[PDB]
């Protein structure tokens, strides 16, 4: 049965707002390098064939009407960890980092950073909950259509490594 662990009722803490903004910046930056590699160029006018698009600008120059597409999934992710009761805290080193506080974007290669075994199990659980979220949405769409049962609607254990890889690396990068 596909269900997400419901987390709409709880609310976000104020301390995590800086982390949300910073991870939104990083996600936007990775988005930017992806389309710079693809050949997309910056420009106010938007054309698909010309690969011109106004949002390869710096995150501060980004308007608010576009910023929600990054903050939103982050908000539901952090709400998912809070719903399970995972106590999230901040070290004094993190507060020191906040004290420290044309456009060539550049991200952090997180692959070299490694998590512990407990954090790996944590990421596996949050990945299972993501696959349940996507499975519930896909099953609602699938009952709306009425046919063509999707092959990946099978349980997360039945899912293989490659199919689980994208969600697993999403959990990995957020924990990193």
């Amino acid at each position: 049965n596909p269900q997400p662990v419901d987390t709409s009722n709880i609310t976000i803490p104020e301390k995590l707002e800086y982390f949300i903004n910073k991870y939104a910046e990083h996600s936007h930056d990775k988005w930017s390098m992806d389309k710079l590699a693809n050949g997309w160029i910056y420009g106010e006018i938007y054309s698909d064939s010309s690969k011109v698009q106004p949002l390869m600008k710096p995150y501060k120059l980004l308007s608010e009407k576009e910023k929600e597409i990054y903050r939103w999934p982050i908000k539901e992710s952090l709400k998912t960890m809070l719903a399970w009761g995972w106590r999230i805290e901040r070290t004094r080193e993190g507060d020191s980092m906040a004290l420290y506080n044309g456009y060539s974007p550049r991200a952090i290669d997180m692959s070299n950073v490694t998590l512990s075994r407990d954090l790996h199990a944590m990421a596996e659980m949050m990945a299972e909950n993501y696959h349940n979220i996507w499975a519930k949405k896909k099953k609602m769409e699938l009952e709306s259509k009425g046919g063509g049962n999707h092959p990946l609607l099978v349980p997360y254990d039945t899912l293989t490594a490659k199919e689980k890889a994208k969600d697993r690396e999403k959990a990995q990068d957020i924990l990193k």
Partner: protein, 34 residues
């Protein structure tokens, strides 16, 4: 532009160590030993 005369008369040597991203620098020490 390095001064060639200084480079020839100097006895000062240098090596550098690059800690790759993802490796905690608090776990890394750099220097000389006997």
């Amino acid at each position: 532009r390095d001064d060639y005369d200084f480079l020839m008369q100097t006895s000062t040597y240098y090596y550098s160590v690059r800690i790759f991203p993802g490796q905690e620098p608090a776990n890394v020490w750099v220097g000389w030993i006997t």
